Amino acid sequence: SKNVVIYADGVYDMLHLGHMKQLEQAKKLFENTTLIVGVTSDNETKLFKGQVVQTLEERTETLKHIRWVDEIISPCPWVVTPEFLEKYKIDYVAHDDIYAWLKRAGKFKATQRTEGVSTTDLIVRILKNYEDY
Amino acid sequence: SKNVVIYADGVYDMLHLGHMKQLEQAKKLFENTTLIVGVTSDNETKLFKGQVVQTLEERTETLKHIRWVDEIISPCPWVVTPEFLEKYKIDYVAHDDIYAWLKRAGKFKATQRTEGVSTTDLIVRILKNYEDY
């Protein structure tokens, strides 16, 4: 089977098991893939989505340790465009409307979120060692 | 060059860039390696070292996403023994005395800790958005 180029993007702040599982899923959409992961810039993430703890360089350096990740675009564009897919020979965008044209072009593949595994969820666990009273 | 079997162990609670860099370093001690990573049990970690947020299954499941990791022993023994090295054909233990016999046997390879990159360090960063007054 031929090699398929998958693109996934996101903030990847405080990388946790939920991100990893999602990346794994994108990487395994087909038998043979190249998973390209895009990491959103600090300025655009804060302006359009919300607060970010780690810088772009930090969020990017952590992602290179993840085994499913074959290439990283950092910073990636805030909006994915058809030109952007042509430039990187992307066959599918893996995400969890704005992606309407992606589905019309047959280039959309869904992946799932895992609740309860987040980095902040672990702090909540730490805090519960401390009875209110 | 021949394949070299490296063993590293630890708690790997709230896996962060510091762990990843250390695993990367163990994995790259030689040109061709198999990196085996041992994950300490909950009971023994809490009794002998200190508190642990994530269960053994959680800490282990996160490590399988790390690209440097070739095999995992979970739970690993709290104390590494010469029999344990013979059983898994381990050529070197990569760690950052108790390891005296390891150095006498030529089976010790040092790896470095990275300060400031820990998961708790990120919470401290979050908290500083909030002026004391």
Side-chain angles (χ1 to χ4, degrees), chain B residues 38-84:
Chain B
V39 183
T40 51
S41 75
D42 295 307
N43 282 10
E44 287 162 318
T45 298
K46 298 159 172 182
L47 175 54
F48 299 144
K49 187 176 176 295
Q51 305 188 247
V52 181
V53 185
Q54 294 183 287
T55 70
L56 172 65
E57 182 169 32
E58 284 171 328
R59 294 184 278 117
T60 298
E61 185 173 347
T62 311
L63 264 178
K64 80 159 172 193
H65 297 275
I66 299 304
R67 93 158 79 234
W68 320 116
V69 172
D70 297 309
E71 306 177 4
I72 295 172
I73 308 179
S74 165
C76 63
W78 187 254
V79 180
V80 169
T81 69
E83 295 81 2
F84 173 88

Side-chain angles (χ1 to χ4, degrees), chain A residues 4 18 59 72 125:
Chain A
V4 178
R59 294 184 278 117
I72 295 172
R125 260 201 231 170

Side-chain angles (χ1 to χ4, degrees), chain B residues 86-98 100-130:
Chain B
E86 251 297 289
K87 172 200 223 193
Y88 296 92
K89 318 224 65 53
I90 292 163
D91 305 301
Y92 301 89
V93 174
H95 225 316
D96 72 282
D97 48 279
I98 43 86
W101 66 275
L102 285 169
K103 286 162 187 192
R104 268 183 298 220
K107 293 197 166 321
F108 185 84
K109 284 297 208 249
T111 62
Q112 289 55 75
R113 275 176 186 176
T114 313
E115 303 333 332
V117 298
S118 92
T119 303
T120 61
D121 294 339
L122 310 173
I123 311 322
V124 173
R125 260 201 231 170
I126 295 176
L127 294 171
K128 297 318 143 139
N129 284 190
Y130 297 83

Side-chain angles (χ1 to χ4, degrees), chain A residues 14-17 20-21 24 51 53-55 58 61-70 116-117 119-120 122-123 125-126 129-130, chain B residues 14-17 20-21 24 51 53-55 58 61-70 116-117 119-120 122-123 125-126 129-130:
Chain A
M14 302 187 287
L15 196 74
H16 53 78
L17 190 46
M20 297 171 205
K21 281 166 90 104
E24 174 181 30
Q51 305 188 247
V53 185
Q54 294 183 287
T55 70
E58 284 171 328
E61 185 173 347
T62 311
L63 264 178
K64 80 159 172 193
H65 297 275
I66 299 304
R67 93 158 79 234
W68 320 116
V69 172
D70 297 309
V117 298
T119 303
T120 61
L122 310 173
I123 311 322
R125 260 201 231 170
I126 295 176
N129 284 190
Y130 297 83
Chain B
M14 302 187 287
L15 196 74
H16 53 78
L17 190 46
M20 297 171 205
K21 281 166 90 104
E24 174 181 30
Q51 305 188 247
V53 185
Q54 294 183 287
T55 70
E58 284 171 328
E61 185 173 347
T62 311
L63 264 178
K64 80 159 172 193
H65 297 275
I66 299 304
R67 93 158 79 234
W68 320 116
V69 172
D70 297 309
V117 298
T119 303
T120 61
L122 310 173
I123 311 322
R125 260 201 231 170
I126 295 176
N129 284 190
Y130 297 83

Side-chain angles (χ1 to χ4, degrees), chain A residues 24-98 100-113:
Chain A
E24 174 181 30
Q25 215 200 313
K27 170 75 183 167
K28 294 178 184 186
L29 287 164
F30 300 91
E31 193 181 306
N32 298 299
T33 60
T34 297
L35 175 60
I36 304 154
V37 177
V39 183
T40 51
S41 75
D42 295 307
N43 282 10
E44 287 162 318
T45 298
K46 298 159 172 182
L47 175 54
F48 299 144
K49 187 176 176 295
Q51 305 188 247
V52 181
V53 185
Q54 294 183 287
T55 70
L56 172 65
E57 182 169 32
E58 284 171 328
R59 294 184 278 117
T60 298
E61 185 173 347
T62 311
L63 264 178
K64 80 159 172 193
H65 297 275
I66 299 304
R67 93 158 79 234
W68 320 116
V69 172
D70 297 309
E71 306 177 4
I72 295 172
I73 308 179
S74 165
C76 63
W78 187 254
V79 180
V80 169
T81 69
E83 295 81 2
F84 173 88
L85 308 180
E86 251 297 289
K87 172 200 223 193
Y88 296 92
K89 318 224 65 53
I90 292 163
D91 305 301
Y92 301 89
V93 174
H95 225 316
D96 72 282
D97 48 279
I98 43 86
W101 66 275
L102 285 169
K103 286 162 187 192
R104 268 183 298 220
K107 293 197 166 321
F108 185 84
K109 284 297 208 249
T111 62
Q112 289 55 75
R113 275 176 186 176

